[PDB]
Amino acid sequence: MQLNPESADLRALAKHLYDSYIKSFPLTKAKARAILTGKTTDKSPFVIYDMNSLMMGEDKIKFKHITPLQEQSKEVAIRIFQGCQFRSVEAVQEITEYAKSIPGFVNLDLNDQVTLLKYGVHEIIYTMLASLMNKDGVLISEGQGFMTREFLKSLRKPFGDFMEPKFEFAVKFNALELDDSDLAIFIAVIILSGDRPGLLNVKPIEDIQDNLLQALELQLKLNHPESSQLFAKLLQKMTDLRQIVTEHVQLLQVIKKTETDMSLHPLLQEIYKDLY
Amino acid sequence: STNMGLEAIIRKALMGKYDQW
Ligand SMILES: *c1ccc([N+](=O)[O-])cc1C(=O)Nc1ccc2oc(-c3ccc(CC)cc3)nc2c1
Ligand SMILES: [Ca+2]
């Protein structure tokens, strides 16, 4: 590895991506981890860890003696997915803003820009979701709440199975200790994916992605002396992010053919809307 | 379009002015 015009160009691109990442994403990983590790002394989320803590606060004591509504699994799942999609609007807008700062992206056919983002955002939302997760739980209600992993896992099927594979992913992804500067390039690589269905012009997307991959390679070597195959491990995380998205799409096919009746407390329905 | 909601948000953000796209 040498310091040469090619390396300096790849560093200039990493710095450009980091600067537009900071402008695009007000909730950075650093800010997420500071909330999860106590540091933000004025940002102290309430922990929801059981049915009692779910219904603490005057606001919520009134669902303690409400009588559980029977509904189809199907209808409860779809209402949750309608809500978390609606609540993703800021993330989608921020990712779109970020994509426009990737050199070459706004020169692509505008329909290809829409295709890259309408598939890419879901993998980047799960990347952001990892930032909100530790082994114990996940930040909810714009960082004011913390829903426990084991409480989510305890809920009746299929809901109790929705989040555990995202936790399994997050604790392993988070163990790589990427920072915001690593993530800026990671996310750019995901967005400039030449394999998205329905792309008109694949080659110019692959040309930008090849340059982003070289910038990621150099970034990880300079930023992570402790992990010599971090680049290969991150390329495998990109596969894992696609598999989680595919699992959502498949589960939705499966739930849509079920006619199971069940209840889910309205306050648990509300919390699932903050997830993905 | 089964994804017209998501596509619209992306399109408005790409084109610049929410109210015109
Ligand atoms: C929302 C809240 C909670 C949960 N949960 O699992 O607990 C899930 C959601 C949710 O709707 N998530 C989700 C995941 C992945 C998705 O991928 C899409 C999608 C992919 C591709 C296209 C074609 C352009 C459109 C949508 N939507 C997803 C929703
Ligand atoms: Ca209109």
Numbering used by the authors:
A (entry chain A): 202 to 477
B (entry chain C): 2345 to 2365
Give excerpts from the publication:
Peroxisome-proliferator-activated receptor gamma (PPARG or PPARγ) is a ligand-activated nuclear receptor and master regulator of adipogenesis. Here we disclose the discovery of a series of chloro-nitro-arene covalent inverse-agonists of PPARγ that exploit a benzoxazole core to improve interactions with corepressors NCOR1 and NCOR2. The extended benzoxazole core brought a lipophilic arene in close contact with the lipophilic surface of the corepressor NCOR2, while the binding of the chloro-nitroarene warhead sequestered Helix-12, an essential binding surface for the coactivator MED1, deep inside the protein. Interestingly, agonists led to decreased signals in the inverse-agonist biochemical assay with NCOR2 peptide, and inverse-agonists conversely decreased the signal in the agonist assay with the MED1 peptide. This indicates that inverse-agonists may induce a structural conformation that disrupts basal interactions between PPARγ and coactivators, further shifting the equilibrium from activation to repression.
The increased Emax observed in the corepressor recruitment assay for para-substituted compounds may be explained by increased or stabilized interactions with the NCOR2 peptide. To test this hypothesis, BAY-4931 was cocrystallized with PPARγ. The covalently bound inverse-agonist 6a extends toward the NCOR2 peptide and is located slightly underneath the N-terminus of the corepressor. para-Substituted BAY-4931 shows hints of the stabilized recruitment of the NCOR2 peptide. The NCOR2 peptide exhibited a modest shift in position, and two additional N-terminal residues of the peptide could be modeled with confidence. The introduced ethyl substitution fits well into a niche formed between the receptor and the corepressor. Addtionally, with BAY-4931, a more extensive water-network was observed that extended all the way from PPARγ–BAY-4931 to the NCOR2 peptide. Comparison of the two complexes otherwise shows minimal changes in the ligand binding mode and protein conformations. Taken together, this is in line with the biochemical and cellular data of the two compounds, showing BAY-4931 is more potent and efficacious than 6a. A variety of small substituents on the aryl ring at different positions showed strong preferences for meta- or para-substitution (6a and 6c (BAY-4931)), while ortho-substitution (6b) dramatically reduced both potency and maximal efficacy in the cellular assays.
